[PDB]
Amino acid sequence: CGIFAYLNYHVPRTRREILETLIKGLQRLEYRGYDSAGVGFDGGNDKDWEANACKIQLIKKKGKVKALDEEVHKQQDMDLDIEFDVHLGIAHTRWATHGEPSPVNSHPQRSDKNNEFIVIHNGIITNYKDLKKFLESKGYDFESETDTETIAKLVKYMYDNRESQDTSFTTLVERVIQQLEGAFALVFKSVHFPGQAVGTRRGSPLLIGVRSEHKLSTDHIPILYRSTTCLFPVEEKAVEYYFASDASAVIEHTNRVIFLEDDDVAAVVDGRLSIHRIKHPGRAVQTLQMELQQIMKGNFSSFMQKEIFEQPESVVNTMRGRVNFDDYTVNLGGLKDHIKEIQRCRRLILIACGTSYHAGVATRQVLEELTELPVMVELASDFLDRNTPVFRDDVCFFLSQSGETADTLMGLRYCKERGALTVGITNTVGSSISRETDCEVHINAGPEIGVASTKAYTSQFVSLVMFALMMCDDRISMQERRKEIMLGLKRLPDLIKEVLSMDDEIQKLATELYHQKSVLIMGRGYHYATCLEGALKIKEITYMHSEGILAGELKHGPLALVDKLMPVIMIIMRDHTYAKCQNALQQVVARQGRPVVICDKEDTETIKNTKRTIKVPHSVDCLQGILSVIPLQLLAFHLAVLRGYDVDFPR
Amino acid sequence: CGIFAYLNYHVPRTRREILETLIKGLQRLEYRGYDSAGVGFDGGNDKDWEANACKIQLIKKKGKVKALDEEVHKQQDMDLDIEFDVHLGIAHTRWATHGEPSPVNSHPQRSDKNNEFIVIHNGIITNYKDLKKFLESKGYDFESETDTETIAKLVKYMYDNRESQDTSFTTLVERVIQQLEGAFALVFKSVHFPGQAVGTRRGSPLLIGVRSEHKLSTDHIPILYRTTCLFPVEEKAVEYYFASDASAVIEHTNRVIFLEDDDVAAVVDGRLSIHRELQQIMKGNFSSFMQKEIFEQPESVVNTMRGRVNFDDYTVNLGGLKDHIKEIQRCRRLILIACGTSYHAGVATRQVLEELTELPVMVELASDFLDRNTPVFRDDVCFFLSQSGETADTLMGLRYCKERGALTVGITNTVGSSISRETDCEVHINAGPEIGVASTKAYTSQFVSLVMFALMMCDDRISMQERRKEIMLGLKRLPDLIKEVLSMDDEIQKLATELYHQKSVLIMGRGYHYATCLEGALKIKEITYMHSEGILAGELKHGPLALVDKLMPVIMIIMRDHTYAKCQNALQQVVARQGRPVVICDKEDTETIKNTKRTIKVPHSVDCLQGILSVIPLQLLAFHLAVLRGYDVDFPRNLA
Ligand SMILES: O=C[C@H](O)[C@@H](O)[C@H](O)[C@H](O)COP(=O)(O)O
Ligand SMILES: O=C[C@H](O)[C@@H](O)[C@H](O)[C@H](O)COP(=O)(O)O
Ligand SMILES: N[C@@H](CCC(=O)O)C(=O)O
């Protein structure tokens, strides 16, 4: 599920430097999870580089990139010092789908025993059964039980049955994808097209990074259907191309990338990058604000720990350039060309999955208060099962850190067909949801490498609060309320630091629950979402049965679980539901429940009457959710560590 | 909470027949509160009834009503052989949501150590904090920490400062209620006013039953302001029954008078003035009410459709809506507000409501609906699902929506309930009294009722005629299919013996069966006390699935509808995690049955009705798990 190819055109690189670059790339893709990896590069030890462009070498292995890196440098009859003026190396980390992990099932997949064509693939070819039967009937021997091998054997079939002896590499791949069905991200290499690469995608991300000390011919690559029309360095030839399924494998070399779209066929021929279609439109060369530092653990022992403790910083990034604390105004540039239409709509629909859905639940109330519109928060999978009524005056938000979640994306396309105005709240540039929405409000929390959503939840939280502030910027009666909320956002990053400084108090609680199998997290109002999110975090990370219960529903059944044995965590803040939360607390205690209470620092009443209490600082009622969810993020983290679990391991 | 009093006027009863009538009344009301109980009756041991009304007796004991019935028939200082020609006895069972269920906090609450004024109360006083300081400054002590003792200590303050030496008992009560805030339903007794009973209400049920072999004076008692009262014409033989519910009175008589807010009933000299079927409540042959009500669903479902669904011509007529259905159709959004199982009923019918009405359908938990101050508009139709018609949050949501001009519809199982009265129109689900503590037949009747409403909202759409026929045919066949599900009772019990020792179980479903897995998880929480949780199958891949291993029990629902393939994927994910789940599926689903060891095979019905059949196995499962764990399915812990 990880792609990375490095094409150095007239930028001399030794075989070692090339291989180190490929390994270095896959290391940026490990966090996605994998079971095997491999590389493809020109073999041969001829001192001259061009004479070796007819001998493709493969080194694949079931295991981790480290073991692959060892297998690379641990080779004989492979001189690592040969200098290549032009070379294309491809690398891939595999997530086994068809065929058990193994060296032969690993990528790159080859077209024959001489490696005339090789390909790396992310996705699934649904119709690989029919295609395999055909190529077998035409005389092609398959060695692996993967769907990918179909792609390698097929491009050779097009090459073997080509009309002219000089048909373009692009043409062959075009004829390949036309027969493929499903989702894929592909990178091809062939001895018959030395130094050339061809990338194409359908339902799977694929981008191309570029670097050159010389001026490039354009920043908008025009499309070519079946010169001035392709990207290249102007006065010289030196250039470096980086194909990748994830920007994290590219950002250390360059931040100029091109995001391919479905059925695009990008080709590098003679060092010049062109983009071909079948069927003026074009693909932009854009600058990413991402930095290598943002995807490194740093001094933290895990990504989960880093992304939790850097939340004072990611909250600020989410507000940067949008909230003016000098005159207390909000401006989301992403909506400038749609805000006037959004304010004439009659309903907000928030559609997401998992923790992204919790972000909607966490901001529904304030959205209702400031927009005065109906606000429906839907789970994308259910939203689709029911064929929910959607109308042309609906504003449908789509919350997705990745921007690729299937159900959320399908919900987007469902709402577009019904004429609704779609808004994306993503954390991934170039993602499907950011592209297909009419407009977006990028979360701007930096990449999330951890398996669970920590800083993404809080940055989504803030993003919707800011939108809510935009929707009432013209209402006199709400000026004070907006000022209150914005002072809270001004003070929020320092309050997050204050909560993180209670990490010791959370560890003592993780020790209290170390042996427990269940825990009930109770809350209501602004902290309903805190229950659901904390309970999901503890489920996902700790593997214990944590459940979020709406405090107002205890009397209707769930209160029967409370006794002297069941652990309970209650959230009680100083908002308008304080009196009702005290009642729930009295119901729990009356049934021999001894709960842990997450309450306000100055809530002296509950602190003296409750043994263990996490005392978070006070914020505005519609922002407390961020501060009260953090102790639950840490609790899940510390419980997992206590139990010997790897928090960064995606179980 | 429950209220019951027995006032026999010129009907000689012994002290045992009265005490056995107070306990017999609390047993009829025990399902509203079984944390503590008490009885208030005249003490003393004289050779008549004209010298025992100066010293009242209180027997209050912790626990259910059974713990009180024994504290009465054991005291070595009480002769249960005295004859009373006139007597008044008040009883009460309490739901101690706060503090301890101790005897002192139990009712009746007294006004002093000599039991001058005793009172029974149902509700909350939203200002006892201020009244407690006003009473403590005049020389009154306080023995308990309940908001109900303030009612006894205050009625005495109005008696120690009365103007004339002949002020009526009603006058003393009218001055009290004027100083009380909130809701309350009171029934007073004293020594100063022997045999006199005063009953008032304000936001709480309170009726008065009347039995007498003599013709009563009138059938419409007139209200009085500060041929007038109800009494037997010929002689003076009459029996009154103050009660907070009609179940404690049907056993003796069916002639009641439903009081109203601020009414102040008063029985003076056996004269009642106002100021300003038994089989349905019997277990029959079942060991518990819950089991009866589950096996009764074939009948309750029919009763819900009776006189409303014509299968010969495929007609659906809900008489309760005949004066609003045309205005309901011009509306532009549906909102379902309820709590707990009633909320699940909305989740279980949301999809079909969206399908047949083509309107937005929003389902809200009343408690959260209020916390957020949800936007509501004049063209909204707000449904309030409430078996009892008295749930506080659902009722407050009703008054909230009314203030904003929405059209309100009640879906209740109780005639005369608050929600029934305050809504513009109602649809009584007519499922019969639900005595079990968990809602079983009420859920499936609310289910059917909303489906019938959906069928009305599309009766003029040509494109939906066939879809309507499909559903109504399913409703015709539903009672027999419910019976088929109940024939698997023994098969469900065996699976329960495999899970009763487990601490958790995940119930997974999607689409029409999201509600099923939510309702099932609640039932297993409520009566078995296992940590059961409902998980939307489509959400497994987003975190919760990490909780599944070969040890975590899992129940899945895989029915034959448009989500079958997706449900198969969720099942394949569970297995990959070494899960060994119990799958509720269709009988013809041979694929699922072959590849899954444990399967509960329910018959196929219409996709929008399958939820009724898929929840019943989970109802029965909760029952058996509770029995296996040694619990009483009736009277679970920590609530009522
Ligand atoms: O801990 C939460 C997980 O990260 C997961 O629940 C996530 O929130 C969903 O899978 C939605 O994914 P997107 O936000 O990328 O759409
Ligand atoms: O099994 C659960 C109970 O039945 C409970 O969830 C009940 O539904 C609510 O206490 C309100 O229900 P009503 O409002 O209909 O009384
Ligand atoms: N379906 C291919 C590729 C899967 C992937 O890595 O995305 C395989 O299992 O080999």
Q: What is the DSSP string of B612-627?
A: HHHHHHHHHHHHHHHH
Q: What is the spatial distance between Cα B84 and Cα B194, in angstroms, rounded to a whole number? A: 12
User: Measured between alpha carbons, how far is B264 from B180 in angstroms, rounded to an integer?
Assistant: 14
Q: Which ligand is nearest to the CA of B410?
A: 2
* Run of H or E residues at A85: strand A83-94
Task: With beta carbons under 8 A apart, name residues in chain A contacting B350.
Answer: 386
Buried residues in A396-422 as b, exposed as e (16+ CB within 10 A): bbbbbbbbbbebbbebbebbbeeebbb
Q: What is the 3-state secondary structure (H, E, C) of A284-319?
A: ECEECCCCHHHHCCCCCCCHHHHHHHCHHHHHHHHH
Contacts of A400 in chain B (CB under 8 A): none
Nearest-CA distance B152 → chain A (Å): 25
Alpha-carbon separation of residue B556 from B444, B474, B582 (angstroms): 20, 23, 6
Containing B107, the helix (H) or strand (E) segment is: none
Report the alpha-carbon distance of residue B47 to residue B42 in Å, rounded.
14
Residue with CA closest to ligand 1 atom 8: A355
> Residue A374 corresponds to which tokens in the numbers above?
């109906």
Does residue B533 sit at the A interface (CB-CB below 8 Å)? yes
Q: Tell me how far CA of residue B349 lies from CA of B135, B300, B447, in angstroms.
A: 53, 18, 6
Strand partners, A426: A400
Show the CA angle centred on residue A224, arms to residues A219 and A225, nearest 5°: 155
Which residues touch A66 (CB under 8 Å, ≥6 apart)?
A: none
How many whole angstroms separate alpha carbon A432 and alpha carbon A406?
A: 10
Cα angle: B29, vertex B32, B34; to 5 degrees: 85
Technique that determined the structure? X-ray
CB distance from A579 to chain B under 8 Å? no
- The amino acid sitting at A534 is G
Three-state DSSP at A49 gives coil
Q: Tell me if B439 is assigned to a ligand binding site.
A: no
Where in the sequence numbering do the catalytic residues of A fall? 1
A150 contact partners, CB below 8 Å, separation of at least 6: A125, A128, A131, A132, A135
Residue B101 sits at φ, ψ, to 5 deg, of: -80, 50
Q: What does the CA dihedral B230, B231, B233, B234 come to, rounded to 10 degrees?
A: 170
**Among the atoms of ligand 2, which is closest to the Cα of residue B412?**
15
- Starting from the edge strand earliest in sequence, which strands make up the sheet with B36-42, in order? B56-62, B36-42, B83-94, B2-14, B238-243, B207-211, B256-258
The Å distance, Cα B524 to ligand 2 centre, comes to: 14
Residue at A509: amino acid letter: L
The answer to whether B57 is annotated as binding is: no
Please state the φ and ψ torsions of residue B3, each to the nearest 5 degrees.
Answer: -125, 135
Nearest CA to ligand 2 atom 4: B439
Determine the angle formed by the axes of helices A624-642 and A528-542, rounding to 10 degrees. 20
Instruction: Report the alpha-carbon distance of residue B512 to residue A637 in Å, rounded.
Output: 35
Cα distance between residue A267 and residue A231, in whole Å? 10
* Beta strand extents in A111-250 (DSSP E only): 117-121, 124-125, 182-190, 197-202, 207-211, 220-224, 239-244
Q: Which residues contact A238 (CB under 8 A, 6 or more apart)?
A: A9, A10, A11, A212, A213, A214
State the Cα–Cα distance between residues A43 and A55, nearest whole angstrom.
5
The reply to whether ligand 2 has any atom less than 6 angstroms from the CB of B56 is: no
Chain centroid offset of residue B545 CA: 36
The Cα diameter of chain B in Å comes to: 86
Count, residues in chain A: 651
B342 annotated to a ligand binding site: yes
Residue B157's Cβ-side half-sphere holds a number of Cα atoms within 13 Å equal to 21
Calculate the CA A379 to chain-centre distance.
19
Q: Calculate ∠ Cα A204-A210-A213, nearest 5°.
A: 175
The CA-to-CA distance between both ends of chain B, in Å, stands at: 9
Q: Is B368 left (phi over 0), alpha (psi -120 to 50) or beta?
A: alpha
- Residues of A with CB below 8 A from B340's CB? 553, 556-557
Residue B27 has phi, psi (to 5 degrees) of -65, -35
In whole angstroms, what is the distance from residue A354 CA to residue A532 CA?
9
H-only helix segments in B149-203: 149-160, 169-177
Report how far residue B435's alpha carbon sits from residue B634's, in angstroms, rounded to the nearest whole number.
Answer: 9
Query: Which residues on neighbouring strands pair with residue B216, listed in sequence order?
Result: B232
Could you identify the residue written with the tokens 């077998």? A136
Name residue, tokens 């499936």. B444
Domains, chain A, with CATH or none:
2-293 (3.60.20.10), 297-499 (3.40.50.10490), 502-651 (3.40.50.10490)
Using CB atoms, which residue from B375, B504, B522 is nearest to A374? B375
Of A524, A525, A560, the CB nearest to B525: A560
Measured CA to CA, the distance from residue A32 to residue A94 in angstroms comes to 10
- Between the CA of A309 and the centroid of ligand 1 the distance, in Å, is 19
- The alpha-carbon gap from A522 to the nearest alpha carbon of chain B, in Å, equals 13
SS3 B639: coil
Q: Is B380 helix (H, G, I), strand (E, B) or coil?
A: strand
β-strands A272-276, A220-224 pairing: parallel
How many beta-carbon pairs under 8 angstroms link A with B?
164
B339 CB within 8 Å of a chain A CB: yes
Q: Do B544 and A540 touch (CB under 8 A)?
A: yes
Alpha carbon distance B628, B621 (integer Å): 10
Nearest to B18, CA basis, from B59, B55, B64? B59
Task: List Cα–Cα distances, B279 to A45, A213, B291, B436, in angstroms.
Answer: 97, 93, 16, 15
Using alpha carbons, list the distances in angstroms from residue A205 to A173, A183, A307, A407, B448.
Answer: 17, 10, 24, 17, 47
In what helix (H) or strand (E) does residue B351 lie, and over which residues does it extend?
helix B340-357
Measure the N-to-C terminal CA separation of chain A; round to a whole number of Å: 16
* A179: DSSP letter: T
Task: Give the separation between CA A627 and CA A529, rounded to whole angstroms.
Answer: 12
Q: Please, which residues have CB within 8 angstroms of residue B121's CB and are 6 or more apart in sequence? A: B1, B92, B107, B109, B148, B151, B184, B185, B186
Instruction: Say if residues A426 and A401 touch (Cβ distance below 8 Å).
Output: yes
Dist. CA B122–CA B92, nearest whole Å: 9
Is residue B437 helix, strand or coil? coil
Retrieve residue B417's tokens.
């309930």
Beta pairing class for A596-600 and B2-14: unpaired
Neighbours of A510 (CB within 10 A): 19
Using CA atoms, how far apart are residues B346 and B343, in angstroms rounded to an integer?
A: 5
SS3 of A405, please?
coil
Q: Which two tokens stand for residue A107?
A: 């990528």
CB distance from B636 to chain A under 8 Å? yes
CA quadruple A503, A509, A515, A517: dihedral, nearest 10: -100
User: Running DSSP on this structure, what letter comes out for residue B34?
Assistant: -
Q: Can you tell me the distance from the alpha carbon of A546 to that of A552, in angstroms, rounded to the nearest whole number?
A: 18
Map residue B435 onto helix, strand or coil. coil
The residue of chain A with its CA nearest to that of B541 is A354
Ligand nearest to the CA of A431: 1
What is A550-589 written as a DSSP string? EGGGGGGTGGGG-SSSS-EEEEE-SSTTHHHHHHHHHHHH
Which atom of ligand 1 is nearest the CA belonging to A537?
1
Is there a contact between B18 and B133 (Cβ–Cβ < 8 Å)? no
Q: What is the DSSP letter of B365?
A: E
What CA–CA distance (Å, rounded) separates B463 from A325?
57
Closest C-alpha to B447, from B605, B273, B574, B330: B605
Q: What residues contact residue B490 under an 8 Å CB cut-off, 6+ apart?
A: none
In this structure, are residues A234 and A216 in contact, taking their beta carbons and an 8 Å threshold? yes
Phi then psi for residue A374, to 5 deg, are -60, 140
Q: How many CA atoms lie within 13 A of A627 on its CB side?
A: 30
Q: Which helix (H) or strand (E) holds A255?
A: none
The CB of A148 under 6 Å from ligand 1? The reply is no
Tokens coding B154:
């205050």
Q: How far apart are the C-alpha atoms of B241 and B208, rounded to whole Å?
A: 5
Residue B493 CA to residue B498 CA, distance in Å, equals 9
